[PDB]
Amino acid sequence: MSEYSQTVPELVSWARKNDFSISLPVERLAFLMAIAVLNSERLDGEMSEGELIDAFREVCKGFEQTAESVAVRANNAINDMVRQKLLNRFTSELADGNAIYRLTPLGISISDYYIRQREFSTLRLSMQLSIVANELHRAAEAAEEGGDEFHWHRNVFAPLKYSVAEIFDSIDMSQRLMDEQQNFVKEDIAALLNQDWQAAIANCEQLLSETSGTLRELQDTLEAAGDKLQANLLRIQDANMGSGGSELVDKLVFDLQSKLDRIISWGQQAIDLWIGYDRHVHKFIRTAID
């Protein structure tokens, strides 16, 4: 059953019924990031209400804001983050009424996007591909060994669903990060050409070649590993078809094959888009020189 069981109309109706909204202006976003940083420096992963207020005061000071009503403003900001599902509040009778706060998976994901310096690493990709290759090989061996529904669920379905699927999602996220890095290089090339285009030709050619080289190295790493991964997914599919055929394992293997095809196709498409931009920049440089 599709990870996303709801059709677009059912989802829009569900979202409207629940009134979900995110409003994080610069001050609120800075406060979320300050909280995320303060939480990472602690041993218990918990923050008290007074500590959150002190953090909000430091943000107000950084924005040169009036010290008037800061306790009230901090409470409104804390209530807004709880209301927007960014913070979980625990009110225990045992704590004499003192509330304990923890960041939600959403609040951590948003804060990490801005604070965590995520750079695309060929080493990270090679490691992730090495772990997934080993996991797929073990799942393929277990599938070929055969067994009962419990053997297939614990040794084939669980590793594919809770390990291989998560690593593929991580690789996809790394590809999306590479997409953002390419757009950053495009902005830098446009800026270098707007400042001093004659002195920027050498720098632009180096940025274009380095980005092309990285995309090619990545695609080469993905193509070299992709065949071995596809072979292991096919081994599991053949073993499943031979041992009756769990529809759940077949659907999961098909989803993994589709995700793997998307991961392999993205690299070729990114190279084609980059080739198009490279030609455009060279045409622009030729037109400007002429």
């Binding site: 209400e49 306790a71 409470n75 009110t91 009778e93 009424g97």
Partner: protein
């Protein structure tokens, strides 16, 4: 009337009906009538909708401790008004503890008879016992 007439606030009613349930409670009869503001507050939040009741303290309340302390202070103030009305007596030397009296049963005037709530309410307003808001 030759003498003016006035009505109690809804927070006074919440504290009044809770003081009434406290008087009846045999589970706490062992205290010999001595209760603490904290116990009253704990019972109140156990029964009523905490976050929706917080709307009366401040229109922006969402469970913040400053707002929780503000609620506790309003309770402390209203309870003092009920003391002047003779509905509760503080201890001679300790103001964090107090004793109830039977006068609190007037807060149960809307339910002492097992009948239609609307008709009861009509009867009460007709008798001059209670007004709506």
């Amino acid at each position: 009337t030759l003498i003016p007439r006035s009505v109690l606030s809804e927070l006074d009613m919440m504290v009044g009906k809770i003081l009434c349930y406290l008087y009846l409670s045999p589970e706490r009869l062992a205290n010999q009538g001595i209760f603490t503001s904290q116990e009253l507050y704990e019972e109140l939040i156990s029964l009523a909708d905490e976050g929706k009741l917080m709307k009366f303290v401040n229109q922006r309340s969402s469970g913040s401790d400053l707002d929780k302390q503000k609620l506790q202070e309003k309770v402390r103030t209203t309870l003092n008004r009920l003391r002047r009305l003779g509905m509760v007596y503080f201890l001679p030397n300790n103001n964090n503890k107090f004793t109830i009296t039977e006068a609190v049963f007037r807060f149960g005037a809307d339910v002492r008879s097992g009948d239609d709530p609307r008709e009861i309410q009509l009867r009460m307003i007709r008798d001059g016992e209670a007004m709506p808001v």
